[PDB]
Write a protein that binds this DNA or RNA. Sequence first.
DNA 1: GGCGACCCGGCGCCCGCTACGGAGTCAACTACGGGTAGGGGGTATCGGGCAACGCGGCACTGAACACCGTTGTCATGTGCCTTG
Length: 49
Amino acid sequence: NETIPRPIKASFREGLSVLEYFISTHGARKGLADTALRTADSGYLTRRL
DNA sequence: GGCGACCCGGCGCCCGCTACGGAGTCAACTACGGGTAGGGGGTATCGGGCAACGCGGCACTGAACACCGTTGTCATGTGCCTTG
């Protein structure tokens, strides 16, 4: 949960560079993990409710 | 000396189903004694295979009577002829 100083200046049509793709993957993997954990927590909440 | 944090234990859980891999593993010994269990051996008991022989309808046995039907049969009555 930090921010980079040099944000991605390229669109997916032009295509990201190497480091741009890497620093995007940094957030993509975290998003997938968050989705999994939120799904589990929502299921448990539904059961309790 | 009850409050107090803090500390610690101790516990409680941690979406849904299908469908989707195998793998399987390190250190005694003998003597006895019985008893059960197996085997064959022999034996009392139960189960399977055949013609008379139970029946029954009727059928024959007609035999021996019965049931009408029949032409046997008889002694006894009309009609004509002869004589009172």
